[PDB]
């Protein structure tokens, strides 16, 4: 659970996934966490979210995973173990955020996307979250979708 134990490589393509081994590495500083899902007019994805987050002084799930020396299984909608691993990592990341949260959300989302079905409900249940603002991945339009 220690955020400073963040240097030794944890490679989940070579070991069994257990989210409790990375709970500390998934911690974030307040008012920095980003989420993302979907595309607008084809524009979006994990890399657009990473660029937007880093330009605004924040982090994403994937940037946190990379920066803390974790390798996740390749996500594939038809490989159950990788679906479960990403769902659990997303849930623990979301459990631990605080303050003002941002999300790069496209107008077209995949069925079963983790944002609508896992992460956003977790954030609404998180008393430490004070605001959720979406950012369109193509246009940059921002909307406050939740403010407690
Ligand atoms: Cl994903
Ligand atoms: Cl859905
Ligand atoms: Cl997803």
């Amino acid at each position: 659970q220690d955020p400073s134990n963040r240097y030794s490589k944890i490679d989940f393509t070579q070991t069994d996934f257990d989210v409790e081994l990375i709970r500390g590495r998934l911690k974030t500083d307040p008012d920095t966490a980003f989420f993302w899902s979907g595309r607008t007019d084809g524009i979006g994805g994990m890399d657009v979210a990473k660029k937007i987050a880093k330009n605004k002084g924040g982090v994403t799930l994937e940037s946190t995973i990379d920066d803390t020396n974790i390798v996740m299984p390749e996500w594939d909608f038809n490989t159950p173990s990788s679906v479960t691993a990403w769902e659990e990592a997303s849930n623990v990341y979301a459990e631990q955020v605080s303050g003002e949260i941002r999300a790069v959300v496209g107008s077209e989302l995949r069925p079963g996307n983790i944002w609508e079905n896992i992460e956003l409900p977790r954030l609404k249940a998180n008393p430490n979250v004070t605001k959720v603002t979406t950012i369109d991945p193509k246009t940059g339009v921002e909307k406050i979708i939740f403010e407690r």
Side-chain angles (χ1 to χ4, degrees), residues 2-148:
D2 164 47
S4 68
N5 179 16
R6 53 182 290 111
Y7 312 110
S8 64
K9 185 178 197 180
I10 292 176
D11 188 342
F12 288 133
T13 73
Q14 309 282 339
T15 58
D16 281 352
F17 178 83
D18 181 354
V19 80
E20 297 300 330
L21 310 173
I22 61 171
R23 174 176 295 272
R25 294 180 184 200
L26 295 172
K27 293 177 178 183
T28 52
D29 295 326
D31 310 306
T32 70
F34 281 63
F35 293 82
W36 72 275
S37 193
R39 303 168 174 282
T40 297
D41 191 29
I43 301 304
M46 140 205 100
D47 274 318
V48 165
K50 193 187 321 272
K51 179 170 176 180
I52 292 170
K54 292 302 178 69
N55 183 51
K56 290 172 171 290
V59 302
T60 63
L61 174 62
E62 290 88 1
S63 80
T64 298
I65 283 169
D66 291 347
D67 293 354
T68 63
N69 301 285
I70 299 161
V71 186
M72 289 288 283
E74 22 187 17
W75 188 90
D76 180 53
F77 68 95
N78 281 339
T79 47
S81 58
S82 66
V83 172
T84 293
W86 279 99
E87 281 192 352
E88 291 182 343
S90 295
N91 194 62
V92 173
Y93 176 78
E95 280 180 10
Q96 301 185 109
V97 307
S98 185
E100 299 192 359
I101 307 302
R102 287 160 287 181
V104 182
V105 184
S107 62
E108 182 163 298
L109 303 180
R110 75 171 186 95
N113 71 92
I114 291 189
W115 167 244
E116 284 184 312
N117 297 281
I118 300 301
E119 289 167 331
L120 179 60
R122 185 63 81 250
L123 294 172
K124 292 176 167 176
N126 184 337
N128 299 327
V129 169
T130 57
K131 191 183 280 173
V132 178
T133 302
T134 61
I135 301 158
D136 186 275
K138 178 182 180 197
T139 69
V141 171
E142 297 192 16
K143 295 187 160 47
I144 301 169
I145 66 165
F146 176 81
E147 180 164 9
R148 187 192 319 259

Short mmCIF file of all heavy atoms in Angstrom, two decimals, residues 39-89:
data_model
loop_
_atom_site.label_atom_id
_atom_site.label_comp_id
_atom_site.label_asym_id
_atom_site.label_seq_id
_atom_site.Cartn_x
_atom_site.Cartn_y
_atom_site.Cartn_z
N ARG A 39 -14.67 7.98 -28.24
CA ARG A 39 -14.12 8.83 -29.29
C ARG A 39 -15.19 9.81 -29.76
O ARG A 39 -16.38 9.55 -29.64
CB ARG A 39 -13.63 7.98 -30.49
CG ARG A 39 -12.58 6.94 -30.11
CD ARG A 39 -12.27 5.89 -31.19
NE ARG A 39 -11.16 5.06 -30.73
CZ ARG A 39 -9.89 5.45 -30.77
NH1 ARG A 39 -9.53 6.57 -31.37
NH2 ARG A 39 -8.96 4.69 -30.18
N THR A 40 -14.74 10.93 -30.33
CA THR A 40 -15.62 11.87 -31.03
C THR A 40 -15.12 12.00 -32.45
O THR A 40 -13.98 12.42 -32.68
CB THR A 40 -15.61 13.22 -30.33
OG1 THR A 40 -16.13 13.05 -29.00
CG2 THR A 40 -16.43 14.25 -31.09
N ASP A 41 -15.99 11.65 -33.40
CA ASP A 41 -15.60 11.70 -34.81
C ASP A 41 -14.28 10.94 -35.01
O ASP A 41 -13.39 11.37 -35.74
CB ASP A 41 -15.52 13.15 -35.30
CG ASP A 41 -15.39 13.29 -36.81
OD1 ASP A 41 -15.86 12.41 -37.56
OD2 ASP A 41 -14.78 14.31 -37.22
N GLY A 42 -14.17 9.79 -34.34
CA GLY A 42 -13.02 8.92 -34.44
C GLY A 42 -11.81 9.32 -33.60
O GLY A 42 -10.84 8.54 -33.52
N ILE A 43 -11.84 10.47 -32.93
CA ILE A 43 -10.68 11.00 -32.21
C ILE A 43 -10.85 10.66 -30.73
O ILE A 43 -11.90 10.92 -30.15
CB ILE A 43 -10.61 12.53 -32.38
CG1 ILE A 43 -10.50 12.91 -33.87
CG2 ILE A 43 -9.46 13.11 -31.57
CD1 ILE A 43 -9.31 12.25 -34.52
N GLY A 44 -9.81 10.09 -30.12
CA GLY A 44 -9.90 9.69 -28.70
C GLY A 44 -8.86 8.64 -28.37
O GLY A 44 -7.77 8.64 -28.94
N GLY A 45 -9.18 7.76 -27.44
CA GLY A 45 -8.24 6.72 -27.10
C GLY A 45 -7.31 7.10 -25.95
O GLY A 45 -7.21 8.26 -25.53
N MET A 46 -6.58 6.10 -25.47
CA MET A 46 -5.73 6.28 -24.28
C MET A 46 -4.64 7.31 -24.50
O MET A 46 -4.26 8.03 -23.55
CB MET A 46 -5.17 4.92 -23.85
CG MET A 46 -3.72 4.90 -23.38
SD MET A 46 -3.00 3.26 -23.61
CE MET A 46 -2.08 3.53 -25.13
N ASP A 47 -4.12 7.43 -25.73
CA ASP A 47 -3.01 8.34 -25.96
C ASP A 47 -3.45 9.80 -26.05
O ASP A 47 -2.68 10.70 -25.66
CB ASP A 47 -2.19 7.91 -27.19
CG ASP A 47 -1.15 6.87 -26.83
OD1 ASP A 47 -0.49 7.03 -25.76
OD2 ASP A 47 -1.00 5.87 -27.56
N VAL A 48 -4.63 10.07 -26.62
CA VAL A 48 -5.16 11.43 -26.60
C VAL A 48 -5.45 11.86 -25.17
O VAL A 48 -5.14 12.98 -24.77
CB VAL A 48 -6.41 11.54 -27.50
CG1 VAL A 48 -7.16 12.80 -27.22
CG2 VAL A 48 -5.97 11.51 -28.98
N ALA A 49 -6.02 10.95 -24.36
CA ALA A 49 -6.30 11.26 -22.96
C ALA A 49 -5.00 11.55 -22.22
O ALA A 49 -4.95 12.44 -21.38
CB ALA A 49 -7.01 10.09 -22.29
N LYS A 50 -3.95 10.77 -22.49
CA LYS A 50 -2.68 11.01 -21.82
C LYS A 50 -2.13 12.40 -22.15
O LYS A 50 -1.60 13.09 -21.27
CB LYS A 50 -1.68 9.92 -22.21
CG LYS A 50 -0.44 9.89 -21.34
CD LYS A 50 0.61 8.91 -21.84
CE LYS A 50 -0.01 7.64 -22.37
NZ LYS A 50 -0.21 6.64 -21.30
N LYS A 51 -2.18 12.79 -23.43
CA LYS A 51 -1.66 14.10 -23.83
C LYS A 51 -2.43 15.23 -23.17
O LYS A 51 -1.84 16.18 -22.66
CB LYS A 51 -1.71 14.21 -25.37
CG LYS A 51 -1.22 15.56 -25.90
CD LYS A 51 -1.06 15.59 -27.40
CE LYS A 51 -0.66 16.97 -27.85
NZ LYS A 51 -0.49 17.04 -29.34
N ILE A 52 -3.77 15.15 -23.16
CA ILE A 52 -4.60 16.17 -22.52
C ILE A 52 -4.31 16.23 -21.04
O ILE A 52 -4.11 17.32 -20.49
CB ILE A 52 -6.09 15.87 -22.78
CG1 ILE A 52 -6.42 16.07 -24.28
CG2 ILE A 52 -7.00 16.75 -21.90
CD1 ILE A 52 -7.80 15.55 -24.66
N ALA A 53 -4.23 15.07 -20.38
CA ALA A 53 -3.98 15.03 -18.93
C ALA A 53 -2.63 15.66 -18.61
O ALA A 53 -2.52 16.52 -17.72
CB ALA A 53 -4.06 13.60 -18.40
N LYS A 54 -1.59 15.29 -19.35
CA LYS A 54 -0.27 15.83 -19.04
C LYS A 54 -0.19 17.33 -19.33
O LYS A 54 0.50 18.06 -18.60
CB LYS A 54 0.82 15.01 -19.72
CG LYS A 54 0.96 13.60 -19.14
CD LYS A 54 1.26 13.64 -17.63
CE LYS A 54 1.35 12.23 -17.09
NZ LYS A 54 2.58 11.54 -17.63
N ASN A 55 -0.91 17.82 -20.35
CA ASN A 55 -0.90 19.25 -20.64
C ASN A 55 -1.61 20.03 -19.55
O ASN A 55 -1.28 21.20 -19.30
CB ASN A 55 -1.58 19.51 -21.97
CG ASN A 55 -1.56 20.97 -22.37
OD1 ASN A 55 -0.50 21.62 -22.37
ND2 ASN A 55 -2.72 21.50 -22.73
N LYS A 56 -2.56 19.41 -18.85
CA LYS A 56 -3.31 20.07 -17.80
C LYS A 56 -2.78 19.75 -16.41
O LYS A 56 -3.44 20.08 -15.41
CB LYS A 56 -4.78 19.67 -17.90
CG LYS A 56 -5.48 20.26 -19.10
CD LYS A 56 -6.89 19.67 -19.24
CE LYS A 56 -7.72 20.38 -20.31
NZ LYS A 56 -8.06 21.75 -19.85
N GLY A 57 -1.62 19.09 -16.31
CA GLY A 57 -1.00 18.83 -15.02
C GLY A 57 -1.54 17.63 -14.28
O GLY A 57 -1.36 17.53 -13.06
N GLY A 58 -2.18 16.70 -14.98
CA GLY A 58 -2.78 15.52 -14.36
C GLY A 58 -2.19 14.23 -14.86
O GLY A 58 -1.13 14.23 -15.52
N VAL A 59 -2.85 13.12 -14.53
CA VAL A 59 -2.37 11.77 -14.81
C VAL A 59 -3.57 10.97 -15.26
O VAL A 59 -4.72 11.36 -15.04
CB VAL A 59 -1.73 11.09 -13.56
CG1 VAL A 59 -0.59 11.91 -13.02
CG2 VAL A 59 -2.76 10.87 -12.43
N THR A 60 -3.31 9.86 -15.95
CA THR A 60 -4.36 8.92 -16.31
C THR A 60 -4.05 7.59 -15.62
O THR A 60 -2.98 7.41 -15.02
CB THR A 60 -4.47 8.73 -17.84
OG1 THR A 60 -3.25 8.17 -18.33
CG2 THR A 60 -4.75 10.03 -18.55
N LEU A 61 -4.98 6.64 -15.74
CA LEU A 61 -4.70 5.29 -15.25
C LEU A 61 -3.47 4.72 -15.94
O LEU A 61 -2.60 4.14 -15.30
CB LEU A 61 -5.89 4.35 -15.45
CG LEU A 61 -5.70 2.87 -15.11
CD1 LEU A 61 -5.37 2.77 -13.60
CD2 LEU A 61 -6.97 2.06 -15.46
N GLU A 62 -3.42 4.84 -17.27
CA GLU A 62 -2.34 4.25 -18.02
C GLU A 62 -1.02 4.96 -17.73
O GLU A 62 0.03 4.31 -17.67
CB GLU A 62 -2.67 4.29 -19.51
CG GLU A 62 -3.80 3.35 -19.90
CD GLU A 62 -5.19 3.97 -19.76
OE1 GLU A 62 -5.32 5.16 -19.37
OE2 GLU A 62 -6.18 3.25 -20.07
N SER A 63 -1.02 6.28 -17.59
CA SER A 63 0.24 6.96 -17.27
C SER A 63 0.72 6.60 -15.87
O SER A 63 1.92 6.42 -15.65
CB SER A 63 0.16 8.47 -17.48
OG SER A 63 -0.48 9.14 -16.39
N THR A 64 -0.20 6.41 -14.93
CA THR A 64 0.17 6.00 -13.57
C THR A 64 0.75 4.60 -13.60
O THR A 64 1.79 4.34 -12.98
CB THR A 64 -1.08 6.08 -12.66
OG1 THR A 64 -1.54 7.44 -12.61
CG2 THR A 64 -0.79 5.57 -11.25
N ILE A 65 0.11 3.69 -14.34
CA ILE A 65 0.62 2.33 -14.49
C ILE A 65 2.04 2.36 -15.08
O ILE A 65 2.96 1.71 -14.56
CB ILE A 65 -0.38 1.50 -15.31
CG1 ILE A 65 -1.55 1.10 -14.43
CG2 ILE A 65 0.26 0.25 -15.88
CD1 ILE A 65 -2.72 0.52 -15.19
N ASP A 66 2.25 3.14 -16.14
CA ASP A 66 3.57 3.17 -16.77
C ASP A 66 4.60 3.78 -15.83
O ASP A 66 5.71 3.25 -15.67
CB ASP A 66 3.50 3.98 -18.07
CG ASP A 66 2.70 3.27 -19.16
OD1 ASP A 66 2.38 2.07 -19.03
OD2 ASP A 66 2.36 3.94 -20.16
N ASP A 67 4.24 4.89 -15.16
CA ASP A 67 5.20 5.62 -14.36
C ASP A 67 5.59 4.88 -13.08
O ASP A 67 6.65 5.16 -12.52
CB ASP A 67 4.68 7.03 -14.09
CG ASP A 67 4.62 7.86 -15.38
OD1 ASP A 67 5.09 7.36 -16.44
OD2 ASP A 67 4.11 9.00 -15.33
N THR A 68 4.78 3.92 -12.64
CA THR A 68 5.08 3.12 -11.46
C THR A 68 5.59 1.73 -11.82
O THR A 68 5.55 0.83 -10.98
CB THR A 68 3.90 3.07 -10.48
OG1 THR A 68 2.75 2.44 -11.09
CG2 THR A 68 3.54 4.47 -10.02
N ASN A 69 6.05 1.54 -13.04
CA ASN A 69 6.79 0.32 -13.40
C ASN A 69 5.90 -0.92 -13.36
O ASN A 69 6.35 -1.99 -12.95
CB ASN A 69 8.05 0.14 -12.54
CG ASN A 69 9.03 1.31 -12.65
OD1 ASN A 69 9.72 1.45 -13.65
ND2 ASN A 69 9.09 2.13 -11.61
N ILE A 70 4.65 -0.79 -13.80
CA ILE A 70 3.72 -1.91 -13.93
C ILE A 70 3.53 -2.20 -15.41
O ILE A 70 3.43 -1.28 -16.22
CB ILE A 70 2.35 -1.59 -13.30
CG1 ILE A 70 2.49 -1.31 -11.80
CG2 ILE A 70 1.33 -2.71 -13.59
CD1 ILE A 70 1.27 -0.55 -11.23
N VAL A 71 3.50 -3.48 -15.77
CA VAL A 71 3.07 -3.93 -17.09
C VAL A 71 1.77 -4.69 -16.92
O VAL A 71 1.74 -5.72 -16.23
CB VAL A 71 4.13 -4.78 -17.80
CG1 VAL A 71 3.69 -5.10 -19.25
CG2 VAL A 71 5.45 -4.07 -17.77
N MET A 72 0.69 -4.19 -17.53
CA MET A 72 -0.60 -4.86 -17.49
C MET A 72 -0.72 -5.86 -18.63
O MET A 72 -0.04 -5.74 -19.66
CB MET A 72 -1.71 -3.83 -17.64
CG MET A 72 -1.91 -2.94 -16.42
SD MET A 72 -2.67 -3.76 -15.00
CE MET A 72 -4.39 -3.81 -15.49
N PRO A 73 -1.60 -6.86 -18.51
CA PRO A 73 -1.91 -7.68 -19.68
C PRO A 73 -2.52 -6.79 -20.75
O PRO A 73 -3.22 -5.81 -20.46
CB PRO A 73 -2.94 -8.68 -19.15
CG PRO A 73 -3.51 -8.04 -17.94
CD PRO A 73 -2.38 -7.26 -17.33
N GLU A 74 -2.21 -7.13 -21.99
CA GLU A 74 -2.86 -6.51 -23.13
C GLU A 74 -4.37 -6.66 -22.99
O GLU A 74 -4.88 -7.76 -22.76
CB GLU A 74 -2.38 -7.23 -24.39
CG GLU A 74 -1.85 -8.63 -24.09
CD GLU A 74 -1.21 -9.29 -25.30
OE1 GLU A 74 -0.89 -8.58 -26.28
OE2 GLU A 74 -1.04 -10.54 -25.27
N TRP A 75 -5.09 -5.55 -23.09
CA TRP A 75 -6.54 -5.62 -23.00
C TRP A 75 -7.12 -6.16 -24.29
O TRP A 75 -6.71 -5.77 -25.39
CB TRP A 75 -7.13 -4.24 -22.70
CG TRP A 75 -8.60 -4.31 -22.41
CD1 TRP A 75 -9.19 -4.48 -21.19
CD2 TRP A 75 -9.67 -4.21 -23.36
NE1 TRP A 75 -10.56 -4.50 -21.31
CE2 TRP A 75 -10.88 -4.33 -22.64
CE3 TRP A 75 -9.72 -4.03 -24.74
CZ2 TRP A 75 -12.13 -4.28 -23.26
CZ3 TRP A 75 -10.96 -3.98 -25.36
CH2 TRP A 75 -12.15 -4.10 -24.61
N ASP A 76 -8.09 -7.06 -24.16
CA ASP A 76 -8.79 -7.62 -25.30
C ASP A 76 -10.20 -7.97 -24.85
O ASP A 76 -10.37 -8.62 -23.81
CB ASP A 76 -8.06 -8.86 -25.83
CG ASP A 76 -8.75 -9.48 -27.01
OD1 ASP A 76 -9.02 -8.76 -27.99
OD2 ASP A 76 -9.02 -10.70 -26.96
N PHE A 77 -11.21 -7.54 -25.62
CA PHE A 77 -12.59 -7.69 -25.15
C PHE A 77 -13.01 -9.15 -25.01
O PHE A 77 -13.99 -9.43 -24.31
CB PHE A 77 -13.58 -6.87 -25.99
CG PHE A 77 -13.75 -7.35 -27.41
CD1 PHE A 77 -14.79 -8.21 -27.74
CD2 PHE A 77 -12.90 -6.92 -28.41
CE1 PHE A 77 -14.96 -8.65 -29.05
CE2 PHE A 77 -13.07 -7.35 -29.72
CZ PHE A 77 -14.10 -8.22 -30.04
N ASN A 78 -12.28 -10.08 -25.63
CA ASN A 78 -12.62 -11.49 -25.59
C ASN A 78 -11.68 -12.32 -24.72
O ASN A 78 -11.77 -13.55 -24.74
CB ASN A 78 -12.68 -12.07 -27.00
CG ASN A 78 -13.98 -11.75 -27.71
OD1 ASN A 78 -14.98 -11.43 -27.06
ND2 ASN A 78 -13.98 -11.83 -29.03
N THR A 79 -10.80 -11.69 -23.94
CA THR A 79 -9.92 -12.41 -23.02
C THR A 79 -10.31 -12.08 -21.59
O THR A 79 -9.94 -11.01 -21.06
CB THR A 79 -8.46 -12.08 -23.28
OG1 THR A 79 -8.31 -10.67 -23.39
CG2 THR A 79 -8.01 -12.72 -24.59
N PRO A 80 -11.05 -12.95 -20.91
CA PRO A 80 -11.64 -12.58 -19.62
C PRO A 80 -10.63 -12.07 -18.62
O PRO A 80 -10.90 -11.08 -17.94
CB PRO A 80 -12.29 -13.88 -19.14
CG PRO A 80 -12.31 -14.79 -20.29
CD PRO A 80 -11.24 -14.37 -21.25
N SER A 81 -9.46 -12.71 -18.51
CA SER A 81 -8.52 -12.32 -17.46
C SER A 81 -8.04 -10.90 -17.65
O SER A 81 -7.78 -10.20 -16.66
CB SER A 81 -7.34 -13.30 -17.40
OG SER A 81 -6.69 -13.33 -18.65
N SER A 82 -7.93 -10.42 -18.89
CA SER A 82 -7.49 -9.04 -19.06
C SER A 82 -8.61 -8.05 -18.83
O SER A 82 -8.36 -6.94 -18.34
CB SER A 82 -6.83 -8.83 -20.42
OG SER A 82 -7.78 -8.99 -21.44
N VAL A 83 -9.85 -8.43 -19.15
CA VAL A 83 -11.00 -7.59 -18.81
C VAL A 83 -11.07 -7.40 -17.30
O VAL A 83 -11.16 -6.27 -16.81
CB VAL A 83 -12.29 -8.20 -19.37
CG1 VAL A 83 -13.53 -7.45 -18.85
CG2 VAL A 83 -12.23 -8.20 -20.90
N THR A 84 -11.02 -8.50 -16.55
CA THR A 84 -11.07 -8.42 -15.09
C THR A 84 -9.92 -7.59 -14.53
O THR A 84 -10.12 -6.76 -13.64
CB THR A 84 -11.07 -9.81 -14.48
OG1 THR A 84 -12.30 -10.46 -14.81
CG2 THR A 84 -10.92 -9.73 -12.95
N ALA A 85 -8.70 -7.80 -15.04
CA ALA A 85 -7.55 -7.06 -14.52
C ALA A 85 -7.72 -5.55 -14.69
O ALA A 85 -7.50 -4.78 -13.76
CB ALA A 85 -6.25 -7.54 -15.17
N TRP A 86 -8.13 -5.12 -15.89
CA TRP A 86 -8.32 -3.69 -16.13
C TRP A 86 -9.51 -3.14 -15.35
O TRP A 86 -9.44 -2.01 -14.84
CB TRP A 86 -8.45 -3.44 -17.64
CG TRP A 86 -7.11 -3.39 -18.30
CD1 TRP A 86 -6.50 -4.41 -19.00
CD2 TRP A 86 -6.20 -2.29 -18.33
NE1 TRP A 86 -5.27 -4.00 -19.44
CE2 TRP A 86 -5.06 -2.70 -19.05
CE3 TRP A 86 -6.24 -0.99 -17.82
CZ2 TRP A 86 -3.98 -1.86 -19.29
CZ3 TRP A 86 -5.15 -0.16 -18.04
CH2 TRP A 86 -4.03 -0.60 -18.76
N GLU A 87 -10.57 -3.91 -15.20
CA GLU A 87 -11.70 -3.44 -14.40
C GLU A 87 -11.28 -3.23 -12.95
O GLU A 87 -11.61 -2.20 -12.34
CB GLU A 87 -12.90 -4.41 -14.48
CG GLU A 87 -13.74 -4.28 -15.78
CD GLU A 87 -15.08 -5.03 -15.73
OE1 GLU A 87 -15.30 -5.77 -14.74
OE2 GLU A 87 -15.92 -4.86 -16.67
N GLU A 88 -10.51 -4.17 -12.39
CA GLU A 88 -10.09 -4.06 -10.99
C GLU A 88 -9.10 -2.92 -10.79
O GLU A 88 -9.19 -2.18 -9.80
CB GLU A 88 -9.51 -5.40 -10.53
CG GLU A 88 -10.60 -6.46 -10.43
CD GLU A 88 -10.12 -7.80 -9.93
OE1 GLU A 88 -8.89 -8.05 -9.97
OE2 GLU A 88 -10.97 -8.61 -9.50
N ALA A 89 -8.15 -2.75 -11.70
CA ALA A 89 -7.22 -1.64 -11.59
C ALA A 89 -7.96 -0.31 -11.69
O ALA A 89 -7.66 0.63 -10.95
CB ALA A 89 -6.14 -1.76 -12.66
#
